[PDB]
């Protein structure tokens, strides 16, 4: 067949990573162990852990654009209100 280019992945046998030595793996057949073994204590304690870490990365970025839209919505409500047409004519 025709030759091909140079990539960053191989296949089973020549995957292309570094040579490894001195690392051992153990596993057990799933017919011999019980799944669902720790679903509780993971739905409570594990989820709370992850939440407490990544929640100020989403809240403050959502805490800025909520007060920015609200002070524009409650400002647009006064500009088109009967008490805020005089400010409307100076911005229209």
């Amino acid at each position: 067949g025709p030759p091909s280019g140079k990539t960053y992945m191989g296949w089973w046998g020549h995957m292309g990573g570094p040579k490894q030595k001195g690392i051992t793996s153990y596993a057990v057949s799933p017919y011999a162990q019980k799944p669902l073994q720790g679903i509780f204590h993971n739905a409570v304690f594990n989820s709370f852990r992850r939440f407490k870490s990544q929640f100020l990365y989403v809240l403050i970025p959502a805490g800025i654009y909520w007060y920015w839209w609200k002070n524009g919505n409650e400002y647009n409500e006064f500009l088109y209100s009967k008490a805020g047409r005089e400010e409307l004519e100076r911005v229209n």
């Binding site: 280019g5 960053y8 992945m9 191989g10 990573g17 920015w68 839209w69 647009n76 500009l79 088109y80």
Partner: protein, 383 residues
Amino acid sequence: MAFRKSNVYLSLVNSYIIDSPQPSSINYWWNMGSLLGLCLVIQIVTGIFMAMHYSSNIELAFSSVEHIMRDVHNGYILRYLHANGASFFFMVMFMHMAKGLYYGSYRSPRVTLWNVGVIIFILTIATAFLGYCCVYGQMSHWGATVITNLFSAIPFVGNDIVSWLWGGFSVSNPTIQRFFALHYLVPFIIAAMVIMHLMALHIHGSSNPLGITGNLDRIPMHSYFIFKDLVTVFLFMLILALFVFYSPNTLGHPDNYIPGNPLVTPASIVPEWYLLPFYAILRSIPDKLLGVITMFAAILVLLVLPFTDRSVVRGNTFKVLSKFFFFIFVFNFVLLGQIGACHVEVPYVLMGQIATFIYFAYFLIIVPVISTIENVLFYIGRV
């Protein structure tokens, strides 16, 4: 060798969905791609069986969709599964386009896989827009007029292209009858671009959330990510079943149930929720020619993103400020589609300019400078 590897036809299936080596630590954000493949089959199959009952004439276009809903056996299942699957198609695609930008999937050596995605992104917008005018609703007539009359801003040539695209002087019978024949063609082009999309994915493979090499720990695609993809398939078909049987018309707009009228305009011409944000970018510029350039650039700005990112780490996982401004840009787009829902009134015009400015500056100023200090904080913090 085994027959699944020796046969000419079964060896392609073997190397793509069976023996393909996957990273052992990709999370549920990597299931989004197979959901788009599932949804592409849904649109086509539910479209061929629904194309057996649709007339593309301007006289019979609207009336035939009612005949599908009232006379065809399970004809309402066909049209709600096809109208809601179009809206579910874009939500999974945004979560596929956003996971790529977070974990730095656009970076080399996967730039071609990134550019083919943008081509796929455009063709799907056109395919959804073209199929939207097929119903010939009141919103589809005026969504057709506004979008097609947009190319009248190209100097000295625009007036002929618009007349060539309409097939005449406005949106009439020659327009709808050629919009439907195109709508049947483009999905076969997307299906061909997905084949080219998976061809560029196979040279280097998928990425992992850690952003590091994944060649050290691989597991086969079959029996691990075939059964993990089955978890999200059943959850996708359950949320879709709720929007089809319990609330079919929530995502759409009620004005599309009026026959299209060329004399009376609706109270508010608004696009669907997925094209809503770019509608604000178009309307922010107080000029006609400059709006088109600004509107289309927002799609094309994604193309320079492999060059602006000056970081030696892929992703936002181990970066405090690069992960920080991402969610503002996420939300700014969420805010960007909010003004487009509101009329052109004080002070939504002023919001419309600053918000679209911060949208464009993320790619061109913040991502390059924060990514720069981050290289320095990483350097002196360890030294």
